[model samples]
Target chain A: DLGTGLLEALLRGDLAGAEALFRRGLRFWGPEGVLEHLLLPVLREVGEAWARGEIGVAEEHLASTFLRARLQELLDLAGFPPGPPVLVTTPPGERHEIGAMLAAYHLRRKGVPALYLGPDTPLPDLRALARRLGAGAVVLSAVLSEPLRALPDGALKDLAPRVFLGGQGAGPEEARRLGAEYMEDLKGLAEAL
Target chain B: LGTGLLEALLRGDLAGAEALFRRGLRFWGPEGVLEHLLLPVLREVGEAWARGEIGVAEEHLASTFLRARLQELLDLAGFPPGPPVLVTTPPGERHEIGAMLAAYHLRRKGVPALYLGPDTPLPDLRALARRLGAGAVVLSAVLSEPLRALPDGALKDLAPRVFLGGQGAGPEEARRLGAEYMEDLKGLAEAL
Candidate 1:
């Protein structure tokens, strides 16, 4: 079956129709459900499709705005715990932050206390934050080879806390090399921490 | 301790307690009880995190479900199908989907898939590629830096279509790499 009414618009490349459906989903499903279920996957799907030559880049990126909104709404939630959470981020030019923001949200929800370092935190500031906060987990993300190259073991030392690694790149070797706990997955990071 | 929760959801069995957090259990037949599906998709989530679309919370969410699903699939994929495609992670790469996803998806599709597992060097893959006479060799790259560093010399003798799949290779990057890139498993297989 062709997904749903909304998916139909997307397949048809009816930009306005697809946008309207996305808004409708947001309005009806409530942000939490939308964030958890739809928005991120949809953007990545579109992005991947655009990358694959299946969808036009401009159209796919335009549709991606809806995804950006879902992410922003999640970040806007209040009531984060007061603690020294080591906010982590991706390296420069790496735009993927869904997992990191979600981690920050889980921290706030869990009462573990957190502050998202956000994407591409400057090296100097990252060092300063680690020194100042005694942050428990220096969550770093590596997807593209570029970011992974930039994220050296020395970066973990700046955290002044137990280094917890997550995202696409951290398998056992990188984890071992950094002397940090490489989470088998994100939940592993949460459990390990 | 496994991918039970995610399997229930993926199968459209919303009534299952896994989604609602209610205490319960049920068998999913011979194809049930996963191990393969869980590991690979979580890598996909990790790829997303590195990119920033998913924050930590969402990463955790997606990973939790994927873990369960992987276990369910792996347990079932243990049986033979076709040519067992051996998969392994790139040397120094953290992600583990290079083989697991191929193993399970192939089994489900009646193709045999074996996994030598993670942290594989180029020479090893080259040797294994010849020994196995495998239909294909799969590579999982989540970062482009390491991807570009790959030695094309090893791949020269391995005639099997290399299905380089992951978020790391965007559309343009996939084309530039001069190999097939796939997000969906069937897409990966068909590329051969």
Candidate 2:
């Protein structure tokens, strides 16, 4: 039901269809349910569809853009109280943010304050922000291994005492390299928090 | 006639190519020279390489020369800014020609960007972005595999904002990262 109505709307650029389904679904799942069960799945589907070339990049962007707005709206409406501010970002040259945003979204859903610093954040800045904000932890999400090469000597390793690296490209080796902990997915992120 | 530069490039005549480029710059603005002549020649060279008419070394040589000349023109343009945009590639992404081209477009528009060249470390990229108070960052990816290989959540955590372009950061990749994926040189030029 979620895929049929919302996915079709997303693919066709029909914003109303998506909004309607999103509003209707809220009655059942509420915010978290709608976000995780209905929304996140649909977002993943869009990625898979794009990868398979079933949808063009513009179309995918339209859908994702719509979803982002809705997510923002949800975040704004919630006006979450202050908690441990978890900074979310990706390494340099690594531009995949959906997973990172999703991580942030989930954290917010759980009432954790998430500061999304955006992709390709320099390592030094990440440390500075963490220190400035007294962040509980800094999460560096890398979708590909290529960005890891951009890490300067001890860029991540130096920050390892407080930084957390995860996502697809990040692993035990990456964790070891950065001297930080590794989180495999959203589940791991949730658990760590 | 105007094809002499291409001919010289084919024969690995660096001096001849540079002379032609210099001559062309006199007649055309930086954007015009790049979009109309230099880029066209670069595209042609890539095509020739694929067709087996030129070897790998010849291809690299042409690119290197083009990169040097482009950087020279870019530097002379001087430091000026409004809504600053930082352009570069991810680490290990050695290709900076596309990044340079995008930077030129932004510069010609009076929105001069900071060109970080290639393989810039993350720590430095962040430091510069904050130091300069950049409004956005543009990353060019020439290879699809490398862009695809970026770890998940790779597009977040920088100061300011992020936009991705070139052949590597496709629409899929851009959407996945929530970054603005520039279609090509022409589109980017128009946008700026």
Candidate 3:
């Protein structure tokens, strides 16, 4: 019932109703439980609709915008435990920003502070920021199988660990090439951190 | 002939395209430059690219130049005095060119407009429409899916009127949304 309601509100572009659903969902599932079980499923449906041409750009963006905002709100409200300084970003051209934001929320929940540098960030800029921040691990969120020819041309050699994030679109070849780990979920990524 | 300009566009020759555009402008004038020369070329490029006849690089190159040129014309055309008509596509639709063209056409008809580009969330669109007291809202959907997910009634309820147009959305979609169906750019502009 909750699942159907959450999905309906989001698909309808009912921002206030969707946010209320999210708050109600939190009361039952807790942060990670609600994120992984409830929020993730509805968000995935919105994305699938976009892919299937069952929905348009604005609706997908609307759902993502609200989801990201809700995640940020929850993360801000929580007292983060002391975890490693990890950086999260997606490669250039990939617009799957919510996944990165979700991971950031997960990491914060696990006591790690994650610096999420939205989407469409060039790899060189990511490396510079990672190095500057002294990040222990750099999580790369790839929502589509992108062509990667070895470490995005000068990713810090053997400094901070490089990790690939995404369930499907993220290819392990890139991570393996860079001697990095491939993580599909926030729980795993947060645990790894 | 149309062949020369189309070929120049395929070759990514901006100088030749610009020259051809300027030459056509004198004969066909403003509307001709947009409706006849530029829009057709862009539509052709999109069709060709979709058919796998043209490379992405070439299509994108032509598009970039054409978009800049169109922006220049629209800028020079200046804002017409009237209540603004807001235009945009729902989120997920990456195509903004058509929406921009729709706005351009409205502006040409002495109608002020705001082109919010692609993927405008419903709440923001609603807020802006009410805030600006928009007389109308033109939604461009290049794919069929957006209509289902978009807040169709809410948009109509807020704005004085809503019009649906573009390649993907059509008469049935407009009817379903309780909005006006604008068949194409020129006809809509003339009517407006």
Candidate 4:
């Protein structure tokens, strides 16, 4: 049961309580060390604790928030690698922007002028401003259906300026079919046409 | 039904079929008002005509084609409403263009103008209105629930001549509330 207290806290992501335990026992790594050691090993603990059904969706969401913020902070302080000016924007009506921001941050660290246009940008403005800025490539990140229907050839002409669409909404196979380049991760994007 | 019309198009509203039908039935004081007017009407006849609902939504959405060209024309000629400047916006609001759009239309009319964008809190709004010292205080409210929720005496604190435009203010409410009611910005312009 000595391990149960720590495991329960870790699964529950009681990082503060778990951190205290980690410090006390030289052999045991706690919440703070979750990404490093205890996390993967404690899968059974999480499964067991969740089986009791106490943790709410908000708790899981909070845990992700903690994990995301910690990772973002580390990534932000990391050095630039090398690359081009990439503009990232949320197409009009697309409000879920954290993914785009993180992606842009990675691009900025890659020696690219990653212009992070937060969300809900009018198409004309993005096109006009991109031309004015002489952007290397425009990355449209959106989950909304409206902008997707509006993009490709009808709404935003794909060829005038090099444009790439990504996120869960941008179908990879369809993007290829349209003769448009596709990207999945930072590495794939960096290597994409 | 628009076999497959977009929702935003519906929301943006097509140019009023009533307005179009009126053009054809002008003899009935608006295109067969007597024949068509009913205390309660059925949906089907108008449903068929919806594809033709080319109102502002049609204009705003289709402007993708010629909006820039029209904007160029807008730049060349201006609205002129001449004298007694009045400015207003929907209360407790961020969308301020209703006033600016009105002001733009008024500019070509050669009118002196002072347009204040959306502001908040009726007391602060009233203070600004009184200070403007203009003959008209044109106030609009899209978010009317909060405004009307205030005590009746509170609304009366504003200048007596304040003109309001909102779904919340009917003619009776305007009279009881001691204010002039404008159906819309165009009505206000006409009143001026």
lDDT of each: 0.53, 0.66, 0.66, 0.46
Q: Candidate 2 lDDT, tens digit per residue, B1-192?
A: 147887765443445676898888878867778867888887887888799675443454456457657766764564453445667787678777888887777776666566655655555565556655667777888887766776665766555567788877778787776677778666664665
**Candidate 4 on B55-99: residue-level lDDT in tens?**
221232222212121222223343332223444553445333344
Which candidate comes out best when scored by DockQ? 3
Q: What order do candidates take by lDDT, descending?
A: 2, 3, 1, 4
Cand. 2 TM to true fold: 0.47
Which lDDT tens digits does candidate 3 get at residues B99-181? Answer: 87887788787676666556787666766677557787788878877777655554456477888888788787677777788
- Report per-candidate DockQ: 0.01, 0.02, 0.05, 0.01
Q: Whose lDDT is greatest here?
A: 2
Q: Tell me each candidate's i-RMS in Å.
A: 18.8, 21.7, 13.8, 19.9
Q: Which residue pairs show collisions in model 3?
A: A56-B146, A57-B90, A57-B91, A57-B92, A57-B93, A58-B90, A58-B91, A81-A111, B91-B119
Clashing pairs counted in every model: 49, 19, 9, 13
**What local lDDT does model 1 show for residue B179?**
54
Model 2 per-residue lDDT at B181:
73
**C-alpha DockQ for predicted model 1:** 0.01
The residue-by-residue lDDT of candidate 1 on A117-147, one tens digit each, is 4465555555554554455667767655466
DockQ of 3: 0.05
Q: What is the lDDT of residue B25 in candidate 2?
A: 82
